């Protein structure tokens, strides 16, 4: 794990099985919002892609309000849900459960970790385990309940190490 490691966030917005945008966010933090607010916030704000057809996605984005907070640093990915829209998620650190894993309001959730990625990666190259996973998908729901929006997340250093072989 060199110092020159690219922990930048790589977002991928999906609306109903269609990739509607990609965004690299070189900041430690960002907030995913429908439309950027006029305020002096130390944290960057990343707008969702504006739906061209306008429905049913637009009705869903207009309920985000506070939106979603994502932190992409040296220790991995962290998220906090501030919106009333339900959010499920799948990531390497998801627990072993039958049903869906839902982001709780007012609780910072650890999605991805670099420590265990390096550990499980060193074990594969040597040959004592499977290769590590890194994508941290997020699924938004809307009213019956349909997964209209999907957001994938990953760090640049992760895919670069694996795709070599």
């Amino acid at each position: 794990l060199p110092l020159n490691s690219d922990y930048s966030l790589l977002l991928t917005f999906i609306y109903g099985g269609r990739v509607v945008g990609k965004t690299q966010v070189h900041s430690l933090d960002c907030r995913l919002v429908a439309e950027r607010s006029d305020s002096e916030s130390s944290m960057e704000q990343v707008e969702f892609p504006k739906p061209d057809p306008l429905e049913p996605t637009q009705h869903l984005l207009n309920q985000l309000d506070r939106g979603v907070l994502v932190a992409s640093n040296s220790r991995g990915l962290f998220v906090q849900r501030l919106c009333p829209i339900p959010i499920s998620w799948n990531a390497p650190e998801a627990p072993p459960g039958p049903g869906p894993h839902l982001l709780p309001s007012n609780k910072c959730v650890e999605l991805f970790k670099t420590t265990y990625f390096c550990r499980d990666l060193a074990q594969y190259f040597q040959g004592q385990g499977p290769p590590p996973k890194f994508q941290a998908t997020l699924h938004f729901w809307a009213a019956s309940q349909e997964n209209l929006i999907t957001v994938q997340m990953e760090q640049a250093f992760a895919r670069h190490l694996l795709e070599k072989i």
């Binding site: 110092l3 922990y7 430690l28 933090d29 607010s37 006029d38 305020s39 002096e40 916030s41 130390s42 944290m43 506070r66 907070l69 932190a71 640093n73 040296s74 220790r75 962290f78 906090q80 501030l82 910072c108 650890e110």
Partner: protein
Amino acid sequence: QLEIENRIQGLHVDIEFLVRSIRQLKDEQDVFSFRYTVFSLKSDPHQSQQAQLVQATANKVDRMRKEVLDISKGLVGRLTTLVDLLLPKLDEWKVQQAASCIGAPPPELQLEQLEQWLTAGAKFLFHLRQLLKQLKEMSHMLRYKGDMFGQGVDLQNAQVMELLQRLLQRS
């Protein structure tokens, strides 16, 4: 009278601006606690960058907290000037009306316009009480709360209530 109309003219604009400032603060207090929590979750020298980030978020919160009190304190004082100017006028109306019953001329200013001004002036004080009530909840963000910031809200909440107590007695 324009001085009133223009006084309550800008009060609308400035309490709106206050409401926006309070939303800006609320949004940022979430930022801090998020970064604070992330910083607490677990060294890599990169963590210095992580701490400097949290350190810079509390300064904005502190700066904003002090800039919100400055706004609302200016409004509290302005609302006082308006109340202190409105109620003596209504007093002069009650007198001039009472005299009209024993042979005086009617008062020039209608009571319909006075009641609207006292209602619009009251609607500002209730709105401001709600906003200070929100800041008092934000003051509970952390354990020590903010002994100086919390007292500023409490001290303004008292003034707002004294202005209401004035208005609600003679209206």
